[PDB]
Amino acid sequence: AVPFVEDWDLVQTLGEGAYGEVQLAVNRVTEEAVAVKIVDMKRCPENIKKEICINKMLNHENVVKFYGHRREGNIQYLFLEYCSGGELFDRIEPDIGMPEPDAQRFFHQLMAGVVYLHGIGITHRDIKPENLLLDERDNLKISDFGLATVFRYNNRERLLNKMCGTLPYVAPELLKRREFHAEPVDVWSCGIVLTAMLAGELPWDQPSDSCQEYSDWKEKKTYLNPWKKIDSAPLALLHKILVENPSARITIPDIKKDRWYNKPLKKGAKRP
Numbered sequence: 001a002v003p004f005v006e007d008w009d010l011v012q013t014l015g016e017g018a019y020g021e022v023q024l025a026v027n028r029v030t031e032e033a034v035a036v037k038i039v040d041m042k043r044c045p046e047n048i049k050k051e052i053c054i055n056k057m058l059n060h061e062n063v064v065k066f067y068g069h070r071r072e073g074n075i076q077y078l079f080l081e082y083c084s085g086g087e088l089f090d091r092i093e094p095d096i097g098m099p100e101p102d103a104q105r106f107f108h109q110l111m112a113g114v115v116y117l118h119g120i121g122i123t124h125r126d127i128k129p130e131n132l133l134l135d136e137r138d139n140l141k142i143s144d145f146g147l148a149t150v151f152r153y154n155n156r157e158r159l160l161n162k163m164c165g166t167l168p169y170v171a172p173e174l175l176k177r178r179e180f181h182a183e184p185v186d187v188w189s190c191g192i193v194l195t196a197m198l199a200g201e202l203p204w205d206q207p208s209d210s211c212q213e214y215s216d217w218k219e220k221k222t223y224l225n226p227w228k229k230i231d232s233a234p235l236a237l238l239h240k241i242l243v244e245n246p247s248a249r250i251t252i253p254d255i256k257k258d259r260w261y262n263k264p265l266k267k268g269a270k271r272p
């Protein structure tokens, strides 16, 4: 009943996506901020319709909250939780990474978000530091469900076959096999994200037989970069995640039992 609370000012561009751009909107009355993802549809309808649908299913503290959407002509609007900390990508110093206690905390929160999605039968399919945003308290939130899909419905798993994602994060089976299980693919990409956080570099362009850096890993040459920059404990976890055979790859229940994952490293937030 308050006269102007449906009014938002568009205060700046947060960035450009393929679809279009994202602008920071601020309520004229409350000063609440939200991100507005703008998707130029004459530039596709299949992508955004499913993205919205999937967003309506989601409610979790480590997943960017979906507030709504409007069609306003040929433009789709998605109203989303504003994550003022920006991309996890920007917290990774090239060639260095970040402090191991920060990397562990981000990884904990990433697993909590991924457990949530998988528990409701959704696979994100493009996990990478660009899509892991950070709120004002540096809490990690999984964003962009534009490539997400259902892998479980009525308690029945469906195998995937659409190739998608981003090559350096993509699991080797998605390049080698016609069909593959969804969950190990997201586990793999989380491993590449962990590697990036701890070494400040991606291990290979793609996990194919034709990629020298990938062969080196499969030959256990961890005296090379990026592996040499990583302490033995997290590296042991990475040996379990970055396993070529997805049926042998560690699952998330088992990641939660891993020694590094459970290693005390980090004290509270600066006077919490």
Ligand SMILES: COc1ccc(-c2oc3ncnc(NCCO)c3c2-c2ccc(OC)cc2)cc1
Pocket: 014, 015, 016, 017, 021, 022, 035, 037, 064, 080, 081, 082, 083, 084, 085, 086, 087, 133, 143, 144
């Ligand atoms: C410090 O600079 C920035 C830049 C972007 C953002 C940002 O905050 C967001 N909150 C919600 N969604 C967001 N993006 C859409 C998917 O959910 C953002 C972003 C943002 C927006 C666009 C972008 O493209 C480069 C990268 C990050 C936050 C801070």
